[PDB]
Design a binder for these strands. Structure first.
Lengths: 180, 268, 93, 246, 133
RNA sequence: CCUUCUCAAACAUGUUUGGUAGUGAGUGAUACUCGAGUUAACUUGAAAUUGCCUUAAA
C-alpha cells in the first residue's frame, strides 16, 4: 500500500528507498518445527528433490520466474555434485518418463526422478501458486539438508562455481567442492 | 601569379576610393576578393565546411585590436564535446594563451545549445554576438541542426572545425595549438555551390596596403593550386571590381551487397 | 536529499536552488511584493475564505494567476498531502 | 487521437527515415568501393559490458554467430519499409523473439539498418544449449494430418527423417552445427522456429511497476541510439540477457 | 456571416496536410485541406486552411482549438467569413538543381567575356578610376 | 508532447584528405557565371490570411 502511494504521488526515489527497506519472511523455524530429526528430513526430502528437478527443467512464463527456475537449477546442481563427489549412488533406471536414481544418504535410501533435457509443454491446467508454495518450502528444506550434509562431510557450503566452466556446460561440474 | 605592381596599385586605388572627403560609414571599408571558377567549387552537393587558407600575416589579432572602438567588439566562441567540457576551464585557456594575447570569451557544449539556447530568439541573440566561432571536429557535424540555419548565412558565424584529440584522447596542448594556428595563420572562406567565391579580407584600417597585397598574393597562390580558377577580382563594398588574373586553357574543360545479405539471411 | 547536501557542505567547510514556492502566507506576501511570476490556486479549499480574496489581490498586483482543480494535486507538486496554493517566482534560463 | 501524438509520430518517423536513408547511401558507397568522398570505410563493433565500460574495435571480417532479440523500438516511430522487410525476412515480426544470425560483411549493414529494434550478442555454448533444450519448437506435418501444427522439438526420429540427408541425427547435432557454423547451418536454423522468449518484467502491481521503471532506466543506460549513419554495432551481455529472459 | 472554412496558424514542424486532415476528420468530414509552403523547398509556412462540410462542425473545431498550446506553439484558429474560398496552395517539394545545356561555342563565349571585360574597362575609365589595361 | 551525424584512415605530439543540405516571413544593395546558380548585412515571442513493434496494458 505504501509503495503504491509513493508511485501514485510520483516519488520514485522514495519508492526505491521503500523497496530497499523491506524484509521478507523465512521458513527456517517452520522447517525446524516440522522436522525435529535430521533422519526425518532425510526420509522426507524425496518429494522435495522430485519437485525441484521438475521445476528446474521448465521454461520461464508469466507465472514462473527465471529467478525461481535458476534457484531450483542451482540447488539441484549442488545436490548432484554432492552425490557425485561422495559416491553414494546405488541404483539407476532409464524409463520413458525420465531417469530414476536411488542413492544412500546417511543410511537411508533416497529415490528421485530427473527429466530429460527437452522442452516440455506447460498444460496451463495446474495450480501454479500451490506448486510454487510447495517449491519454496522444499527449497528451504533442501537448503537446510544440504548445509548439514556438507558440514558433516567436511565441505564448504555453498560451494563456489567456476564461471568459465558454467559457460561451457551449465552442469554439476561448475561447482568445485573444497575441503576445510 | 599576380603582378606585384598591379596589385599594389589596385589596393592603393581602392583605399584612396574610400576616403573621398549607421552602417553607411562602416560597411563600405571591407575588402572583398571575388573568385570566378569555370565549374562549381563543390559540385552537386552543398558544403558548409569553411576552407582555411594560410597567410603569413595575422588577421584576427588586428580585429581584436581595432574592435575596442566599436559597438560590437570582437568575441570568440568555443564549442566542445559534452564529455570533454569538464576537462577544460577558463584558466586552462588563460595560462596557455595569455602570452599571445588570445582570449576565449565563452565555452559552451551541445547540452547548452540544446537546453539554454533552444529558443530561436535567444539562440540568435547568443550566436550573433560572437565573431570567431571554433568547434570541435567531432561535434561540428551536428551543428546545422543545433545552431540553426541563420548562423550559416555569414562567414564569421560559421563554426571552424579544429583538431582537439591526440592519440584518440582529449589534448589541451593540441587544442591550444589549433586555436593559435587558426587565430594567427589561417582565414576562413565559404565555398558556395555556384561559381562566385567571396573572400572577406578584413578592413582597410586594420592592416597596411602592403600587408593586404601579401595576403592576397598568398591567397591567389594557394587557390591556383587548389582549384582550376578562371577570374580574380578585388573590390570594396559599394565599389566596382578590378580584375587581376586571366587564363584560357582551363576553360577547355567546359565541353549488390544489400541483396547478397538479404539472400544470406533468407532461407531460399 | 537535503541530508545529502548538508554532508557535502560539511566536507567543503552549493549552487542557487530553484523551487516551487508554497504556503499561503508566504505566497500572499510574494504576491504583495510582486515577486511571484505565476500563481496556481486550488479550487476545493474549505474554508474558502483562505483563498477567496486571492484572484482580486493578484489582479490588483498584476500577478498572473490560475485557478486549478486539486489541492491534492498541488500537494503532490510540493511534497505534501494538500496545498492551497503554489507559486513560481524564479525559473532557469 | 491527439494532435500532439500525431505530430510526435510524424517527426520521429521522419528522423528514422532520414537515418535509414543516410545509412543506405553510405552502404551503397561502400558496396561500390570507388567513392572519393566518405566519412569512414570500415566496420566497428562496440561492446558494452558491466559502472559500465565500452570498447570499440574493428570488425575482423571473419563470420560470427550472433543471437538477435527483437525489442520494442523507439517511441512513436513507425517502422520504415526497409527495416520492416529485413525484420520480416529475419522472422522478427514481434517482440520477445530471438533468432541466430551468421554475421558477415554483407550482414553488417543490415544490422546497421535494424539497430534500434534489436539487441545483438555473442551467445555462449551453454546459452545456446539452454535455448534449444528449453524453448525448441518446429513445424511438423503428420502423415494422417492435413494441416501441420507447431510442436516442441521432442522427437529425435523427426530430426533424423527431416535432416538425415545432411548428416544431422539429433538435437545435439543441431546444437553442434549451430555453434560451429558448419554446413547446413542455415538448414538447421530455419528448421528451428524462432525462439519465443518471456518478458523480464510482467504485471502491473506496485512492485512490477517499480521493476519496469528500473528496467527502462537500465535499458536506456545500455542501449544508445547514435543516429550518426556510421554507428558501431552494439554488442551487450547476451548471456545475462538470456538468463533474465529464459 | 461565417463559412465552413477554418484558418489555422502557428502550426508546429510536424503539422502538415495529412496530419491536419487526420486530426480534424474526428471533428468532421473535410472537403479540402491545404498548407502554405515555400516554393523552392518543401517546408511549411506554419499556416493552412481546412474546409468542413458542416459549418457547425467548423465552429466547434474553432472553439475547441482556438487557444490550444501544442509543442510550445499556441495554435490560432479562426472561422473565415461568408465566401472567400481557399485557392492557390500547391504542395511544393524540395526542388533539385541540374546543369543545363550550353549551346554557345567556346569562341563565342570567349568573345562575349572579352566584350564584358572591355565594358568593365570602359566603366572604370568613366567612373574616374585610373587603373592599367 | 518525439528529441537532433558528439568522426575516420595515411605518414612521421605534428602534416594532409574526406565527413556538416537549415523554422518561417520580410528589408536590401553589388557584383559574377550560363528563368538557373552564386554575392556586403538587418529585424523577429517557436511571429504567420492563400506566389497554382502493443505488458508504456486497463
Amino acid at each position: 500500500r505504501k509503495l503504491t502511494r509513493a508511485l501514485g504521488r510520483g516519488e520514485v526515489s522514495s519508492a526505491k528507498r521503500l523497496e530497499e527497506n523491506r524484509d521478507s519472511y523465512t521458513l527456517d523455524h517452520i522447517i525446524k518445527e516440522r522436522y525435529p530429526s535430521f533422519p526425518d528430513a532425510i526420509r522426507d526430502i524425496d518429494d522435495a528433490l522430485n519437485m525441484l528437478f521438475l521445476f528446474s527443467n521448465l521454461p520461464s512464463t508469466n507465472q514462473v520466474s527465471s529467478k525461481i527456475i535458476n534457484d531450483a537449477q542451482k540447488i539441484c546442481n549442488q545436490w548432484l555434485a554432492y552425490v557425485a563427489k561422495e559416491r553414494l549412488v546405488r541404483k539407476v533406471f532409464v524409463s520413458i518418463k525420465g531417469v530414476y536414481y536411488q542413492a544412500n544418504i546417511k543410511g537411508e535410501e533416497v529415490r528421485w526422478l530427473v527429466p530429460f533435457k527437452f522442452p516440455e509443454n506447460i498444460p496451463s491446467d495446474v495450480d501454479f501458486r500451490i506448486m510454487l508454495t510447495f517449491l519454496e518450502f522444499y527449497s528451504t528444506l533442501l537448503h537446510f539438508v544440504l548445509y548439514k550434509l556438507y558440514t558433516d562431510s567436511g565441505l564448504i557450503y555453498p560451494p563456489k562455481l567456476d564461471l568459465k566452466k558454467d559457460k561451457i556446460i551449465s552442469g554439476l561440474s561448475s561447482y568445485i567442492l573444497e575441503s576445510r | 601569379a599576380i603582378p606585384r605592381e598591379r596589385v599594389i596599385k589596385a589596393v592603393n586605388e581602392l583605399i584612396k576610393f574610400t576616403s573621398k572627403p549607421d552602417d553607411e560609414e562602416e560597411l563600405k571599408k571591407d575588402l572583398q576578393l571575388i573568385v570566378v571558377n569555370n565549374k562549381s567549387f563543390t559540385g552537386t552537393s552543398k558544403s558548409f565546411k569553411l576552407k582555411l587558407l594560410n597567410v603569413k600575416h595575422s588577421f584576427y589579432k588586428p580585429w581584436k585590436e581595432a574592435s575596442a572602438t566599436a559597438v560590437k567588439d570582437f568575441k570568440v566562441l568555443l564549442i566542445l564535446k559534452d564529455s570533454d567540457i569538464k576537462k577544460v576551464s577558463e584558466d586552462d585557456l588563460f595560462d596557455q594563451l595569455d602570452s599571445e594575447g588570445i582570449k576565449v570569451d565563452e565555452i559552451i557544449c551541445g547540452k547548452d545549445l540544446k537546453t539554454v539556447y533552444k529558443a530561436y530568439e535567444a539562440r540568435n541573440a547568443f550566436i550573433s554576438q560572437f565573431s570567431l566561432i571554433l568547434a570541435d571536429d567531432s561535434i561540428v557535424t551536428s551543428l546545422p541542426k543545433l545552431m540553426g540555419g541563420k548562423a550559416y548565412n555569414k562567414v564569421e558565424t560559421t563554426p571552424i572545425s579544429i583538431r582537439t584529440h591526440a592519440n584518440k584522447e582529449f589534448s589541451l596542448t593540441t587544442l591550444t595549438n589549433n586555436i593559435k594556428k587558426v587565430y594567427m595563420n589561417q582565414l576562413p572562406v565559404k565555398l558556395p555551390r555556384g561559381t562566385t567565391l567571396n573572400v572577406h579580407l578584413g578592413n582597410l584600417e586594420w592592416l597596411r596596403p602592403e600587408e593586404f597585397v601579401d595576403n592576397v598574393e598568398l591567397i591567389s597562390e594557394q587557390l591556383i593550386k587548389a582549384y582550376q580558377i578562371r577570374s580574380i577580382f578585388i573590390k570594396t563594398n559599394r565599389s566596382p571590381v578590378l580584375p587581376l588574373y586571366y587564363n584560357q586553357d582551363v576553360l577547355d574543360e567546359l565541353e549488390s551487397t544489400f541483396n547478397k545479405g538479404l539472400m544470406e539471411i533468407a532461407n531460399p | 536529499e537535503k541530508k545529502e547536501r548538508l554532508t557535502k557542505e560539511a566536507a567543503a567547510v552549493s549552487p542557487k536552488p530553484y523551487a516551487v514556492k508554497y504556503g499561503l502566507n508566504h505566497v500572499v506576501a510574494l504576491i504583495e511584493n510582486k515577486k511571484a511570476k505565476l500563481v496556481l490556486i486550488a479550487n476545493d479549499v474549505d474554508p474558502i475564505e483562505l483563498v477567496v480574496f486571492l484572484p482580486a489581490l493578484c489582479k490588483k498586483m498584476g500577478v498572473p494567476y490560475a485557478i486549478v482543480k486539486g489541492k491534492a494535486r498541488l500537494g503532490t507538486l510540493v511534497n505534501q498531502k494538500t496545498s492551497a496554493v503554489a507559486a513560481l517566482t524564479e525559473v532557469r534560463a | 487521437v491527439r494532435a500532439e501524438s500525431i505530430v510526435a509520430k510524424t517527426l520521429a518517423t521522419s528522423r528514422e527515415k532520414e537515418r535509414i536513408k543516410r545509412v543506405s547511401i553510405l552502404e551503397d558507397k561502400k558496396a561500390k568501393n570507388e567513392t572519393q568522398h566518405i566519412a569512414s570505410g570500415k566496420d566497428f563493433i562496440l561492446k558494452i559490458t558491466e559502472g559500465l565500460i565500452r570498447e570499440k574495435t574493428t570488425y575482423d571480417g571473419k563470420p560470427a554467430l550472433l543471437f538477435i532479440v527483437r525489442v520494442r523500438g523507439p517511441l512513436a516511430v513507425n517502422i520504415p519499409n526497409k527495416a520492416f522487410k529485413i525484420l520480416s525476412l529475419l522472422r522478427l515480426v514481434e517482440t520477445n523473439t530471438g533468432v541466430f544470425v551468421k554475421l558477415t560483411k554483407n550482414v553488417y549493414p543490415l544490422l546497421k539498418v535494424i539497430a534500434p529494434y534489436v539487441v545483438i550478442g555473442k551467445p555462449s555454448l551453454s546459452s545456446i544449449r539452454s535455448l534449444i533444450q528449453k524453448r525448441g519448437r518446429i513445424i511438423y506435418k503428420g502423415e494422417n494430418e492435413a494441416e501441420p501444427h507447431e510442436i516442441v522439438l521432442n522427437d529425435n526420429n523427426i530430426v533424423e527423417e527431416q535432416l538425415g540427408d545432411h548428416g544431422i541425427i539429433c538435437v545435439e547435432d543441431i546444437i553442434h552445427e549451430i555453434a560451429t557454423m558448419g554446413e547446413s547451418f542455415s538448414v538447421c536454423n530455419f528448421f528451428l522456429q524462432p525462439f519465443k522468449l518471456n518478458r523480464e518484467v510482467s504485471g502491473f502491481g506496485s512492485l512490477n511497476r517499480l521493476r519496469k521503471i528500473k528496467q527502462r532506466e537500465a535499458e536506456s543506460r545500455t542501449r544508445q541510439f547514435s543516429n550518426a549513419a556510421t554507428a558501431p554495432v552494439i554488442e551487450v551481455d547476451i548471456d545475462s540477457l538470456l538468463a533474465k529472459l529464459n | 456571416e461565417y463559412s465552413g472554412i477554418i484558418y489555422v496558424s502557428r502550426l508546429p514542424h510536424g503539422f502538415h496536410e495529412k496530419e491536419l486532415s487526420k486530426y480534424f476528420a474526428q471533428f468532421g468530414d473535410l472537403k479540402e485541406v491545404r498548407l502554405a509552403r515555400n516554393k523552392k523547398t518543401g517546408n511549411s509556412r506554419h499556416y493552412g486552411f481546412l474546409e468542413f462540410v458542416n459549418k457547425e462542425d467548423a465552429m466547434i473545431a474553432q472553439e475547441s482549438m482556438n487557444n490550444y498550446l501544442l509543442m510550445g506553439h499556441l495554435l490560432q484558429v479562426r472561422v473565415l467569413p461568408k465566401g472567400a474560398k481557399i485557392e492557390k496552395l500547391y504542395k511544393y517539394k524540395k526542388r533539385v538543381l541540374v546543369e543545363k545545356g550550353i549551346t554557345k561555342p567556346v569562341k563565342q563565349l570567349k568573345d562575349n567575356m572579352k566584350q564584358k571585360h572591355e565594358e568593365r574597362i570602359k566603366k572604370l575609365a568613366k567612373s574616374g578610376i585610373e587603373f592599367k589595361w
